[PDB]
Structure 1
Amino acid sequence: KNIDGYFKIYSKHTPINLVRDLPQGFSALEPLVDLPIGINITRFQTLLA
């Protein structure tokens, strides 16, 4: 998200045992970094190896 120019990035890595679509569960994501970028964002993509 972009809050007052600070592009916020949260993260959480947890193990699972899943063989289908998104698992039903709950887990709080912690702040990773705070990036004062200040650029408007309207589209985004995802990198894939």
Structure 2
Amino acid sequence: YFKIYSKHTPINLVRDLPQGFSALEPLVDLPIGINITRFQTLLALHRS
């Protein structure tokens, strides 16, 4: 089971992580049943 927990926070700090506490609500539980050892972040390019 792949458990994904999520939390969305409005912040106004410029560079680093704000210091505080926010509990992450569970977002989804996926019955994927696969071996995971590596992960990748997906970004979006901007073209002009």
Asked whether the two chains share a fold, i.e. TM above 0.5, the reply is: yes
CA distance in 2, matches of 1:21, 1:29: 19
C-alpha root-mean-square deviation of aligned residues, in Å? 0.8
Q: Which runs of 5+ in 2 are unaligned?
A: none
Kindly name which structure, 1 or 2, has the bigger radius of gyration based on alpha carbons: 2
CA distance in 1, matches of 2:32, 2:12: 37
Deviation at 1:37, TM superposition (A): 0.7
Greater fraction of residues in strand: 1
TM-score by length of 2: 0.82
Same amino acid, percent of matched pairs: 100
Q: Does 1:39 align with 2:34?
A: yes
Aligned length: 44
